[PDB]
């Protein structure tokens, strides 16, 4: 139970999540239904890959 959440950055991106919070256990693949290609798939990583622009 908490009173309110952690810091959430409103950063906006399209193909790669930026400035996020790493997964704890492992790579987690989340989708509303994995047998419905109209539903997007979110792959959330447990180790960052820095991109230098």
């Amino acid at each position: 139970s908490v009173q309110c959440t952690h810091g959430i950055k409103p950063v906006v991106s399209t193909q790669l999540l930026l400035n996020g919070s790493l997964a704890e256990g492992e790579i987690i693949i989340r989708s509303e239904n994995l047998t419905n290609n109209a539903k997007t798939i979110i792959v959330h990583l447990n180790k960052s890959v820095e991109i230098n622009c």
Binding site: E32, N33, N36, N37, A38
Partner: protein
């Protein structure tokens, strides 16, 4: 209300490209995926892809990938959308009816379908037909139509007077690339030798009208 109006039929040559249209005007168009289905002659439907109206992102299977390209164009205020399919490299097995369906929910249930656009690709551009009578020997007798392009051709008897007992078979596409059919009507055996019967064929794309008497 929803009015998923689709464009008319198209006839082209192998190796060409055809853009099949589709128009939606009567709902909140931006919140429902628009899918494309194709139907081979006398076969069940087949998936082609879906397009997201908001972002235009398409999704196609492996075999269609690389050739087909789905696109959308919104109006000034998104009240009217137009969806197009550019099917590059039209090959032999592309003669099919194309539907633009509207997905409604997460069950992939399509409450609204488009009227349909018959797309056919081949050589032998529009030309006149050849009409063959059948020599008579209640019975049945009729005429035959051959080597016309493209569909359709209608056969009327006695210049729009006789239509009872007509059996106009669906047209068949032979190996040449042309179209043919045979239309027969039933008639009492006592009418032969006393009544004059004529078969009239109208071919609108070729603007050819042929009326032929049938006699023994």
């Amino acid at each position: 209300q929803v009015q998923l109006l689709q464009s008319g039929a198209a006839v082209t040559k192998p190796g060409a490209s055809v853009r099949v249209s589709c128009e939606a005007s009567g709902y909140n168009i931006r919140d429902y995926f628009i899918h494309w289905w194709r139907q081979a002659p006398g076969q069940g439907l087949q998936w082609v892809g879906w397009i997201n109206p908001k972002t235009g992102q398409p999704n196609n299977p492996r075999q269609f990938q690389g050739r087909v390209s789905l696109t959308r164009h919104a109006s000034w205020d998104f009240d009217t959308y137009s969806f197009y399919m550019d099917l590059k490299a039209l090959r032999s097995d592309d003669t099919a009816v194309y539907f633009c369906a509207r997905q409604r929910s997460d069950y992939w249930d399509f409450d609204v379908w488009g009227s349909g656009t018959q797309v056919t690709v081949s050589s032998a551009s529009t030309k006149g037909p050849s009409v063959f009578p059948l020599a008579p020997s209640t019975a049945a007798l009729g005429c035959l139509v051959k080597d016309y392009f493209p569909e359709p051709v209608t056969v009327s008897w006695n210049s729009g007077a006789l239509t009872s007992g007509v059996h106009t078979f669906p047209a068949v596409l032979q190996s040449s690339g042309l179209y043919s059919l045979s239309s027969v009507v039933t008639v009492p055996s006592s009418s032969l030798g006393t009544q004059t019967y004529i078969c009239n064929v109208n071919h609108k794309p070729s603007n050819t009208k042929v009326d032929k008497k049938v006699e023994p």
